[PDB]
Amino acid sequence: MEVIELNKCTSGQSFEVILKPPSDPSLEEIQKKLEAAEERRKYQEAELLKHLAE
Amino acid sequence: MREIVHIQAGQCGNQIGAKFWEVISDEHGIDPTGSYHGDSDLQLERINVYYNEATGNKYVPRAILVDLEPGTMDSVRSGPFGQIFRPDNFVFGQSGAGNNWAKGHYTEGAELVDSVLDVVRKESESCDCLQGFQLTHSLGGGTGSGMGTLLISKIREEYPDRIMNTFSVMPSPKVSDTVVEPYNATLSVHQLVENTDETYCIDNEALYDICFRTLKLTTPTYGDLNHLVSATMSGVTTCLRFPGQLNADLRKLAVNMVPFPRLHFFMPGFAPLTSRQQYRALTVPELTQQMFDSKNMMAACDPRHGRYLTVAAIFRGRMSMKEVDEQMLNVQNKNSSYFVEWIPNNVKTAVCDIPPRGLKMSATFIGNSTAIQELFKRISEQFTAMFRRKAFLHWYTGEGMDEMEFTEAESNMNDLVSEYQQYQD
Amino acid sequence: MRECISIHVGQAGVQIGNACWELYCLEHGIQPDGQMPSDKTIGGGDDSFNTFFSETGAGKHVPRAVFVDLEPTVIDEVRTGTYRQLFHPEQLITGKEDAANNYARGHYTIGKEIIDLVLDRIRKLADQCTGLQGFLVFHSFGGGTGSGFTSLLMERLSVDYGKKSKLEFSIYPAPQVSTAVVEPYNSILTTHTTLEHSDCAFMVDNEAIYDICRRNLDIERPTYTNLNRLISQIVSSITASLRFDGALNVDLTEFQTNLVPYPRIHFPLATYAPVISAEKAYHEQLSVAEITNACFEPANQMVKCDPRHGKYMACCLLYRGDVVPKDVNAAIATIKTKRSIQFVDWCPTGFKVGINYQPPTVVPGGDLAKVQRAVCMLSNTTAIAEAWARLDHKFDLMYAKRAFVHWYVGEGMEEGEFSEAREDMAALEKDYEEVGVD
Amino acid sequence: MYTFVVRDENSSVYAEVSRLLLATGQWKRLRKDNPRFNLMLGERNRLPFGRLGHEPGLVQLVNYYRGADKLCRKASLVKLIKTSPELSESCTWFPESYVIYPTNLTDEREVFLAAYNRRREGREGNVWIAKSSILISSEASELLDFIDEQGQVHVIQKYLEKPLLLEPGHRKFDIRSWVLVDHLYNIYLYREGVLRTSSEPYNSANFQDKTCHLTNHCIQKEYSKNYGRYEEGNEMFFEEFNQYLMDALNTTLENSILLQIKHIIRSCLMCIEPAISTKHLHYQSFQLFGFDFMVDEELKVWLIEVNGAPACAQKLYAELCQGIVDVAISSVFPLAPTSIFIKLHHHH
């Protein structure tokens, strides 16, 4: 039941008690994911308009 | 500023649409001349959803009246709130559609559709941010059915990423005008399966049975039936027209109600439905039990014949929200065999402090149930009883249609019924 | 002095952010007009509160905050609210139409068109910081913006501020206070894409906040205002070390050092006590032991789960009010001999304690009663995995039928991202089981 | 209307409880995967406790205590008794036991041999028994070589070479007691116990034939040749066993045995109460336990093991199962005596 690293200041204090010892995607890659999904949306909408044109 | 553009087409579409604007105009304090005379800020919080604001503080409905004959719209322009509509938003012809889907969709209707879209484009161009469209119409006639679905097809082509909702009156032989209604409804349903996000199915037989059995109306008229539709339409649009702890536009509502794109046909209901024992205060348990009772449903389908994919219940008026959750959680936890177990928490509840006119409190029911397949089954059976003999087909082939298009509408309908069947087991 | 920028995304993030900055101002003596009478350095200074507030020459103390929403109605309340004067227009960003509870819509469709704008507004706040620490990101799991746009922002922040820490305050979905059905999809989609970008995330389950408001505050049907006032108290307890003089958790880096020895397992459980109803005649003030003991009752946890059946990897005790170390250690010893506190064998069995003498500030007219001492325990338990399990199960039920998937694919998301995200959660659940169970 | 789900189709006990619940017309059974339930009759292994108590408006109850396995596992029970100060290592009613992991995998091998050599040197009876989740030998070499041939954790404990033998027959036996713990952690002891008697005469000079040493109902009905001779199905109920103790030993079942049994049940269940109690939890638990006891010729009771998913005697299914509904289920979900249980009061 030890107390270690006791620090005291005007507005409080802090300490540590030990009860027992122990035993990314680049900017370019993000643009491709975003643009890839935008392209699939464009493809789907084109197939809708083609359907409506038929 | 999430505006909705309203469109009403054909006799049924315009008579039901007329009453709808009559009902909600009253709820927002708008008199027949478009002047606001309410007493609560809640009446204007979301007024622009359905109304434009003209000079002089005048509110004009964002509504477009369509028909292939003048009669019904002349009646609207002379009705109670007829003067409130933008004169330029009446688009009509003179030939009529003869209860013929081909006339509304391919011949007479095609001659008029461009000028209808001119008005729609005008209303949309004036919207800060368009939510989507709503169409009121019947499926048994020719204008609302044939030209209504033509309008939807062209609105989707020009506004592909806007929400398209309809209130669609399904025909029934008990309340029928012509024998070709199954032909017209079957041709329309396929259009709706493809080009609407949410369709509130309203069955004239259910509207009839409610007026006779529950409401005790000896010989119901079309006006009586439309009173139920008005009240229901006001109910389903409550959480769009008034401010509340629910921030939901048409798209967010569709996302949570439609798990599969083609299964977007809803059963609406309303409570109370009291015969004239009418001043009796209705308790929360009674509201809840009635709102889930088939006799209060307008699709003429027994929910116990299928399973609910999603359910939305809207409670209006001052009541115990704590007591609402208890009764709601009582209906589900007492009949969980009719809710699918693969959509967690598929029963949602919304509240609104403003009750309808002349009611301390009410409840509107919105169910996406697989039992709706029974409605499409009836239609399909009536369609095939005539089509196997090619009866009355000449009215359609005389307008350029071929028998192949009927066979395809038949298959599409039966595929729809088959799709509901698998999600019920 | 090092600065911290707060980012609030979606309705939940923005409304929670609004409640926190209200509390922060009451705590630091800042008036709604931005003025701070006790700040004797006009237009400058490197005090502890300056980590969250900048200063204009006119003496206004301006939050280092950015609010983002794909729809304007929630952020409009901030613009016309009580503290409208704190923020300038550049800090409030609103779109035209939201993500409709659709992760793909917030992440791809809409997010792609507004991400660069948000980064620009954040870059402006960063340019005011002499030593920017990192970011605090508030958002919901369930919303389309809070889930979908947040994960996109986190990816870009890692690119634009590689060496900066990022902490989360995430709202876990609860059906009792939600009308959405697809939130399990959004939660798992956003956790998958945010996992490698968040150094420490404090999940708050709305179900827990809801029950605390009904049980302790006697609110029959809590609103978001009630939930957010309680949530802002817990957030304040966690960020107090960054805003006040102290030696524990003095920078965002210390939250990872003291609470996350394994990077993927970075979701500490928060427990708070006491929550007393203001409407009470007058409550008996609780002792250090009793409020510390309450930190091991499931009823006061931000996420309902049973820590008795997990293992601890770290544990912080953050006290506010009349508390002296002697009383903390005495109560801890008593709890060890009574409670089930099992630590992982490769971690010390200890407790880092921070005490701030200023007791919890309560908003006038709020639901919380003024108490003489309160504590927030931040413990990293494997028990919080119960929350991932619950969420992953709901996901599986809907995805087995592909229910609602078309809405996401329709916005440009590939169906494969569903399975790729779920499998990442399956590995996250396996990590917990390897650290906790024997 | 109360709802429940069944997730263990093999439980003879809760199969009857589920049969009774439906007989009241006030409980409804749902599909085993329906989360909207009041009562869960859960599976034995990997019961998902984390998914309980999260359905809005539903008070949910389950028939298993999360964490009770610590008591119902061979090796776990040994560790709990040795490491729990409430039970201590000098616990007088539990045979000297040791946890031994096979060499192909802490472990108490060296500690066991220490006490073993102590007995072998002191002329004391040095017969032990090995078992896991069976071999009886007097040589430690045989006991250890038998565990290494397997692959799971085992436990070696002292063998009661002085068991109380019923007469006539000169035959061993064990006592089964059913204990129900409800959500309030009240400890109820079913007034009806059963003795599973060996139909073979006890023989101390030949542990090779395990038919007279193991009183399991399946071994006696499979490898014994006197099954059902003295009592029907090698099952003697308390009425007879009590009448026997009076005629033979001039004592009662209450005084000579039951007092120790009730004391042992209390000590075990009170020990783990802080770890498994559902008092302040978002869901509630209750569980039926089956304690197995041994009695020596001095009328001292010894705890053999605790079963978490016990079966019941055919004659006592209706009475006990109904008792489960009375105090365990209806106490939480009431419906629209002379109790069959004995409440073991204690301090919570």
Ligand SMILES: Nc1nc2c(ncn2[C@@H]2O[C@H](COP(=O)(O)OP(=O)(O)OP(=O)(O)O)[C@@H](O)[C@H]2O)c(=O)[nH]1
């Ligand atoms: N605690 C708390 N939760 C909230 C609050 N607002 C929304 N939520 C929760 O957040 C989830 C809904 O997501 P929102 O944050 O509202 O949606 P969003 O992030 O704005 O994204 P959109 O879909 O574009 O609206 C639900 O689980 C709500 O319960 C709030 O103010 N406080």
Ligand SMILES: Nc1ncnc2c1ncn2[C@@H]1O[C@H](COP(=O)(O)OP(=O)(O)CP(=O)(O)O)[C@@H](O)[C@H]1O
């Ligand atoms: N230390 C010991 N001394 C004497 N006999 C013992 C003993 N340990 C076990 N036995 C005998 O073994 C039998 C119990 O075995 P045990 O309970 O370990 O196996 P088991 O658990 O598979 C049967 P169940 O769990 O169904 O009661 C008793 O009949 C008892 O006579």
Ligand SMILES: Nc1nc2c(ncn2[C@@H]2O[C@H](COP(=O)(O)OP(=O)(O)O)[C@@H](O)[C@H]2O)c(=O)[nH]1
């Ligand atoms: N509920 C209701 N149904 C109507 C009304 N008018 C017609 N119908 C139904 O609508 C179908 C006829 O379509 P109708 O609207 O008259 O044809 P249209 O003018 O060409 O669109 C039949 O099934 C009628 O029963 C009405 O006012 N209310």
Ligand SMILES: CC(C)N(C)c1ncnc2c1cnn2C
């Ligand atoms: C998404 C559902 C369950 N919710 C919350 C709703 N709430 C209120 N009115 C609604 C809906 C849906 N459609 N309409 C007309």
Ligand SMILES: [Ca+2]
């Ligand atoms: Ca013409």
Ligand SMILES: [Ca+2]
């Ligand atoms: Ca200063």
Ligand SMILES: [Ca+2]
């Ligand atoms: Ca990083």
Ligand SMILES: [Mg+2]
């Ligand atoms: Mg007509």
Ligand SMILES: [Mg+2]
């Ligand atoms: Mg939002």
Ligand SMILES: [Mg+2]
């Ligand atoms: Mg056993």
